[PDB]
Short mmCIF file of N, CA and C in Angstrom, two decimals:
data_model
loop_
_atom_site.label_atom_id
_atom_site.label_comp_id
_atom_site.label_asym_id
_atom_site.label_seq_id
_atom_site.Cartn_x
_atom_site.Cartn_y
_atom_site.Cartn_z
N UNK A 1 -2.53 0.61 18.12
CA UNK A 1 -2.16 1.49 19.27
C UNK A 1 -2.42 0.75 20.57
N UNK A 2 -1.20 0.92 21.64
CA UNK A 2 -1.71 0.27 23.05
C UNK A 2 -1.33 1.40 23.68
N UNK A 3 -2.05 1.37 24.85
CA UNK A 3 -1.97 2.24 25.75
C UNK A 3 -1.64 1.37 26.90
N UNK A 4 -0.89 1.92 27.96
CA UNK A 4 -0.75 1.02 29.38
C UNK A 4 -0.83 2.13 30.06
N UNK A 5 -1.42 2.02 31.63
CA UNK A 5 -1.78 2.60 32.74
C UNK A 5 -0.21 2.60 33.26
N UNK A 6 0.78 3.36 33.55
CA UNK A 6 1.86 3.50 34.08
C UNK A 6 1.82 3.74 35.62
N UNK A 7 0.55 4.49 36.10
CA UNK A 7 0.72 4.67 37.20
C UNK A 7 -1.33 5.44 37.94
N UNK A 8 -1.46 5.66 38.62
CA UNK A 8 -2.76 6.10 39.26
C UNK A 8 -2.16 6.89 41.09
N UNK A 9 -2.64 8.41 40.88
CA UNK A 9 -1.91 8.63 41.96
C UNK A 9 -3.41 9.93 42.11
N UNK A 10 -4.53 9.31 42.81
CA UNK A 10 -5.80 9.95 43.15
C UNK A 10 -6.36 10.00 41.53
N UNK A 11 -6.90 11.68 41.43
CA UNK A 11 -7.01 11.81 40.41
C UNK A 11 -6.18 12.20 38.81
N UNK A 12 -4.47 11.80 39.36
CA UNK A 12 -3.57 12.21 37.95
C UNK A 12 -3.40 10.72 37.60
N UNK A 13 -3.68 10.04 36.50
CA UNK A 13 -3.09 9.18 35.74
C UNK A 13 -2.12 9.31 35.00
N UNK A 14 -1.47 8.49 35.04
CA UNK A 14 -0.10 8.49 33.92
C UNK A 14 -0.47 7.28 32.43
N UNK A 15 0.02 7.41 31.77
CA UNK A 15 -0.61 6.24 30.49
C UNK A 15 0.45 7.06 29.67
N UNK A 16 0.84 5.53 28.97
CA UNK A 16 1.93 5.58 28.09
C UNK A 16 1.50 4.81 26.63
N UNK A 17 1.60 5.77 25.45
CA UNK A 17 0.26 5.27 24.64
C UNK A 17 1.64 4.78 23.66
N UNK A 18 1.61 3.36 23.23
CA UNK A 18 3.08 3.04 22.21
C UNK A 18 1.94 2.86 20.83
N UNK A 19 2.87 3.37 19.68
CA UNK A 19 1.72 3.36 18.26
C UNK A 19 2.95 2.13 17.60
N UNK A 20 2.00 1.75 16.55
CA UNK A 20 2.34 0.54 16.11
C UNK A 20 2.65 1.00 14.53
N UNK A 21 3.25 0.62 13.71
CA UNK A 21 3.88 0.36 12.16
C UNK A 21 2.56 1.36 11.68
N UNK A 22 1.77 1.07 11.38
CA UNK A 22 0.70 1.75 10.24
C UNK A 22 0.13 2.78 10.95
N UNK A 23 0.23 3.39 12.12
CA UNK A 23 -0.05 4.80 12.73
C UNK A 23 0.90 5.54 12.71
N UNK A 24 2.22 4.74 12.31
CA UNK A 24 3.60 5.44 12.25
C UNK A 24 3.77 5.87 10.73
N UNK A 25 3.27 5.12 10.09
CA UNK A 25 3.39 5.83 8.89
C UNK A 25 2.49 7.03 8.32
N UNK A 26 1.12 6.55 8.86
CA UNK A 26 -0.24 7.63 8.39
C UNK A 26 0.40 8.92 9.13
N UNK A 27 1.18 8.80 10.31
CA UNK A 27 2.06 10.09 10.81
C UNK A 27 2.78 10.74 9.75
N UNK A 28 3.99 10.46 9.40
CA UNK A 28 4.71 10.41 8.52
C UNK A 28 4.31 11.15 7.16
N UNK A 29 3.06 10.17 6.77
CA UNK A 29 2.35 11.20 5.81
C UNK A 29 1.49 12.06 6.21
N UNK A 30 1.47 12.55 7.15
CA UNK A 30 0.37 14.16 7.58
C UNK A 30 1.66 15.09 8.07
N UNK A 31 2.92 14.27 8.37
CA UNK A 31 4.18 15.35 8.22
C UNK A 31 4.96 15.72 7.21
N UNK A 32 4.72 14.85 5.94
CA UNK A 32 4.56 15.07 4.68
C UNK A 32 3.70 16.31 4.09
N UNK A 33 2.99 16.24 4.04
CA UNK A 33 1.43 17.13 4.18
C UNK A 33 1.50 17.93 4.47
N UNK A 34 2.36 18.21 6.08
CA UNK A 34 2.16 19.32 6.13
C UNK A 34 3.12 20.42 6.25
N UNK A 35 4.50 19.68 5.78
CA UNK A 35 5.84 20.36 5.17
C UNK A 35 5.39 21.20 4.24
N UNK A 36 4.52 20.27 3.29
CA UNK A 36 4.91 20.82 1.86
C UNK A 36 3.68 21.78 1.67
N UNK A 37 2.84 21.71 2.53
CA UNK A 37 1.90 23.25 2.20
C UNK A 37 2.97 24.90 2.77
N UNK A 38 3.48 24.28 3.67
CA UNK A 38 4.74 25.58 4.17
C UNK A 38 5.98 25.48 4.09
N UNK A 39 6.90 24.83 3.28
CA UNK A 39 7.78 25.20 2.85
C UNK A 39 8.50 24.67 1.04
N UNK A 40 8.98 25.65 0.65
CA UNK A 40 9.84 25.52 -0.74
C UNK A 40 10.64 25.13 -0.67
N UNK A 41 11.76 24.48 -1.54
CA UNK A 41 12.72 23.88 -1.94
C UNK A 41 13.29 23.96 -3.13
N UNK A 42 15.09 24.55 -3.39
CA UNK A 42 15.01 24.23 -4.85
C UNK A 42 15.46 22.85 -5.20
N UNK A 43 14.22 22.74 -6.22
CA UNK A 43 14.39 21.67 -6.93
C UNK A 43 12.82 20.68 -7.09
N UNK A 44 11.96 21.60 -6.84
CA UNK A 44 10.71 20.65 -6.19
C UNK A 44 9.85 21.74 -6.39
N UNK A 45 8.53 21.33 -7.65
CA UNK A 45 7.83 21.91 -7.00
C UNK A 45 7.33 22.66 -5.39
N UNK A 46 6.25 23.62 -5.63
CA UNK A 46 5.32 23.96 -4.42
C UNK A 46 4.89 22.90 -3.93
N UNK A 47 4.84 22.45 -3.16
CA UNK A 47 3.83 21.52 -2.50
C UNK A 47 4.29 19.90 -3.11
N UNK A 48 5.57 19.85 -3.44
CA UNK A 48 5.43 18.25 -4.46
C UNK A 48 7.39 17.79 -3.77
N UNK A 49 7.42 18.20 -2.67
CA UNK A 49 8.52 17.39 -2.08
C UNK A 49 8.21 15.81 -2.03
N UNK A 50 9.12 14.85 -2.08
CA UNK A 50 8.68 13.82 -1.84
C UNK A 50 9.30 13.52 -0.32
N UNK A 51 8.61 12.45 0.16
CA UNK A 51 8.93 12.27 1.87
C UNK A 51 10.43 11.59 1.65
N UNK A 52 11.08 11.13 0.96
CA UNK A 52 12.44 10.81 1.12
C UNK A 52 13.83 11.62 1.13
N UNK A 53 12.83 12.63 0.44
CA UNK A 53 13.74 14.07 0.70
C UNK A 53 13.62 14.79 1.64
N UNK A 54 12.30 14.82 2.30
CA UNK A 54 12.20 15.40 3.24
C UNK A 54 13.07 15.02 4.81
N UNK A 55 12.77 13.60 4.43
CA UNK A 55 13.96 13.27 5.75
C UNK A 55 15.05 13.24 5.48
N UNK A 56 15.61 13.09 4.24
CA UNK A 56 17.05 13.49 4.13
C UNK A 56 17.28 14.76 4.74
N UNK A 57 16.94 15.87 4.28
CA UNK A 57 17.05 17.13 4.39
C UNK A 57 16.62 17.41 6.32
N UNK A 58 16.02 17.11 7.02
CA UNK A 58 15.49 17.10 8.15
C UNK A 58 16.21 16.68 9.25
N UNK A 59 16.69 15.27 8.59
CA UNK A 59 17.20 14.48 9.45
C UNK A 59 16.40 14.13 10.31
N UNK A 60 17.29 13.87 11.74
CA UNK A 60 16.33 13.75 12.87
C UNK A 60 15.12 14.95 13.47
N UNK A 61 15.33 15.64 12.86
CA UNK A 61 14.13 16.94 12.84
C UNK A 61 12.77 16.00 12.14
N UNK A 62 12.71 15.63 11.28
CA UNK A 62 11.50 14.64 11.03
C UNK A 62 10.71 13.64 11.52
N UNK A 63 11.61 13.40 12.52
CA UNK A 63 10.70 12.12 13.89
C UNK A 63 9.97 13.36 14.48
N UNK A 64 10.60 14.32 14.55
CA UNK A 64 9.29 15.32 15.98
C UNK A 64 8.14 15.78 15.16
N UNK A 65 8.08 16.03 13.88
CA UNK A 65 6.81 16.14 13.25
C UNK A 65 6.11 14.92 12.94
N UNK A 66 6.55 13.83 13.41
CA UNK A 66 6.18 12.54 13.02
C UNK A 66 5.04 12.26 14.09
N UNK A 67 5.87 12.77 14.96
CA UNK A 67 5.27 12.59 16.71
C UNK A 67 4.52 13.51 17.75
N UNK A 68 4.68 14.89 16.56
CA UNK A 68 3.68 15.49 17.16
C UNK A 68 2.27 15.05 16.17
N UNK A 69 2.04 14.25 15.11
CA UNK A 69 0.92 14.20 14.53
C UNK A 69 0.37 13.06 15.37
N UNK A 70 1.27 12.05 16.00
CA UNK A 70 1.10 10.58 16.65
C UNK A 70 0.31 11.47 18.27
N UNK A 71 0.75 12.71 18.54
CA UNK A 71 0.18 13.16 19.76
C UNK A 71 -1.50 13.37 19.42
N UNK A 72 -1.45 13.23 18.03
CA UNK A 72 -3.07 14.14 17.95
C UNK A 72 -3.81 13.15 17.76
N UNK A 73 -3.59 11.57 17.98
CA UNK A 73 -4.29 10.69 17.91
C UNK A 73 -4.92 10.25 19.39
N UNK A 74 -4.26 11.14 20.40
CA UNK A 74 -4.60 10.61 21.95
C UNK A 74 -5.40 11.13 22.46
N UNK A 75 -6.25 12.37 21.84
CA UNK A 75 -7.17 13.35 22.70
C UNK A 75 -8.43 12.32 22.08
N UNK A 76 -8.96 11.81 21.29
CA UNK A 76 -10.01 11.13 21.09
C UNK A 76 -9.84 9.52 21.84
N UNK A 77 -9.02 9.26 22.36
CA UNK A 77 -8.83 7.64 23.10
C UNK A 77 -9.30 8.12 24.59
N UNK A 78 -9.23 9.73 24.86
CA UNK A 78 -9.75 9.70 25.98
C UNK A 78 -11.46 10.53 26.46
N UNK A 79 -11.95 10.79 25.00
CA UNK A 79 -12.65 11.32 24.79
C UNK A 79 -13.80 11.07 25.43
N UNK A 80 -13.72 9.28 26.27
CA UNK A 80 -15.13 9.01 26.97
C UNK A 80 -14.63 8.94 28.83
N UNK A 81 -14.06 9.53 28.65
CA UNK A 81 -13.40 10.56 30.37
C UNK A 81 -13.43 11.82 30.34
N UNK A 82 -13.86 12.04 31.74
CA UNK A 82 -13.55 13.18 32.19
C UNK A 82 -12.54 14.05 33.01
N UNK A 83 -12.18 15.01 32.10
CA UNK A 83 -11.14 15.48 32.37
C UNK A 83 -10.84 16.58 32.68
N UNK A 84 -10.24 17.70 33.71
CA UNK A 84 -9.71 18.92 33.60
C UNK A 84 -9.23 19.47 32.91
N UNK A 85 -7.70 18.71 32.57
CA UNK A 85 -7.08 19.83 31.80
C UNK A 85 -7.22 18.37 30.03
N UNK A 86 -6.14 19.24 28.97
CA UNK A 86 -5.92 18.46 27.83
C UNK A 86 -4.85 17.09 28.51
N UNK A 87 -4.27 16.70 27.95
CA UNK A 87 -3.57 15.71 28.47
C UNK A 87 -2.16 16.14 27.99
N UNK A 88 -1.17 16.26 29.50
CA UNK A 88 0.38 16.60 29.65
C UNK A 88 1.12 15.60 29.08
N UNK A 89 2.46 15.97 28.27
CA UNK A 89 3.01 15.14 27.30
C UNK A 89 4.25 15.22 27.97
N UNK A 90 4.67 14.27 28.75
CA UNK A 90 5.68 14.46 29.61
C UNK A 90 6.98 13.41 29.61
N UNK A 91 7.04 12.39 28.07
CA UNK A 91 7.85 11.86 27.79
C UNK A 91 7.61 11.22 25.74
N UNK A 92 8.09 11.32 25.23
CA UNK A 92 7.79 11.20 23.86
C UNK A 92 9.29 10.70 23.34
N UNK A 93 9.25 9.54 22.46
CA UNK A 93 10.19 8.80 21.80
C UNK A 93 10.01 8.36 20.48
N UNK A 94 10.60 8.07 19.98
CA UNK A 94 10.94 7.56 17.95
C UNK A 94 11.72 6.46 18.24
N UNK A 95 11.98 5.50 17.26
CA UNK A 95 13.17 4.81 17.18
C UNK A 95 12.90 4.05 15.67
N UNK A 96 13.61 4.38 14.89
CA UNK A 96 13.80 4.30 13.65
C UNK A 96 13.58 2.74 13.51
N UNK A 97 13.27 1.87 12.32
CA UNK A 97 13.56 0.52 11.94
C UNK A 97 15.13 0.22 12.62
N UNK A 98 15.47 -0.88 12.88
CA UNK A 98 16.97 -1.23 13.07
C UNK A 98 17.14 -2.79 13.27
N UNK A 99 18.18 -2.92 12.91
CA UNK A 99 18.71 -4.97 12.60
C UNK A 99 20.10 -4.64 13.10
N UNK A 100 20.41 -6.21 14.04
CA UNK A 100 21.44 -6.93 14.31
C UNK A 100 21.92 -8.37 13.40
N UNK A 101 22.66 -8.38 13.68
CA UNK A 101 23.24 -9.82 13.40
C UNK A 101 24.69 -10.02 14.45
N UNK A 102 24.77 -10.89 14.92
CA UNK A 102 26.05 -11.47 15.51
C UNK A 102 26.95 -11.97 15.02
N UNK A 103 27.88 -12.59 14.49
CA UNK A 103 28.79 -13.28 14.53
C UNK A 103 29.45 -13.83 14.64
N UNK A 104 30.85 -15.00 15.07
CA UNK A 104 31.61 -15.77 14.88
C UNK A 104 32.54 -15.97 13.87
N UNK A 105 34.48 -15.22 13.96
CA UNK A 105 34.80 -15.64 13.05
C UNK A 105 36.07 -15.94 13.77
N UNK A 106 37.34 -16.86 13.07
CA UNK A 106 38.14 -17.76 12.90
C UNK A 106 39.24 -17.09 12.02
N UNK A 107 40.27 -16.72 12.92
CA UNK A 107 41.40 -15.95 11.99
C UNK A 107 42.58 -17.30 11.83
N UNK A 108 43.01 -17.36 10.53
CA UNK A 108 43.76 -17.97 10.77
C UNK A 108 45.16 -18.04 11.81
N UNK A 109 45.91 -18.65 12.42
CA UNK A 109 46.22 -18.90 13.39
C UNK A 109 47.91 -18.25 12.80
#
């Protein structure tokens, strides 16, 4: 996990906390977790969805439970400050694995 200071304006800070591969997944599985204590499916046990179905079925609905579990990792990073309120969540993003490749090709003439 990194955090960067985005901005300082008196006493409101801004901080933009980016999580890395293996906080993205331990997410993932506590949104796993916690699908399958509240909801059924036919074809699946109670409680025994597997997470590949779950995002099938979800779709992009499955990054925001991904990311609200990734939110519950930020109230203890600030735990040795003092603070007024909880901390305002005022921009939040996903972006799936993804690959390029370029090309070059030669039609015959």
């Amino acid at each position: 996990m990194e955090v960067k200071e985005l901005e300082r304006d008196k006493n409101r800070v801004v901080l933009e906390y980016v999580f890395g591969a293996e906080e993205i997944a331990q997410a993932e599985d506590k949104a796993v977790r916690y699908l399958n204590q509240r909801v059924e499916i036919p074809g699946f046990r109670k409680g025994r969805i597997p997470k590949n179905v779950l995002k099938m079925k979800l779709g992009e609905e499955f990054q925001e439970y991904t990311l609200d579990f990734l939110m519950d990792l930020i109230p203890d990073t600030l735990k040795d400050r003092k603070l007024i309120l909880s901390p305002i969540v005022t921009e939040r993003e996903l972006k799936d694995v993804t690959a390029r490749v370029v090309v070059e090709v030669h039609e015959e003439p």
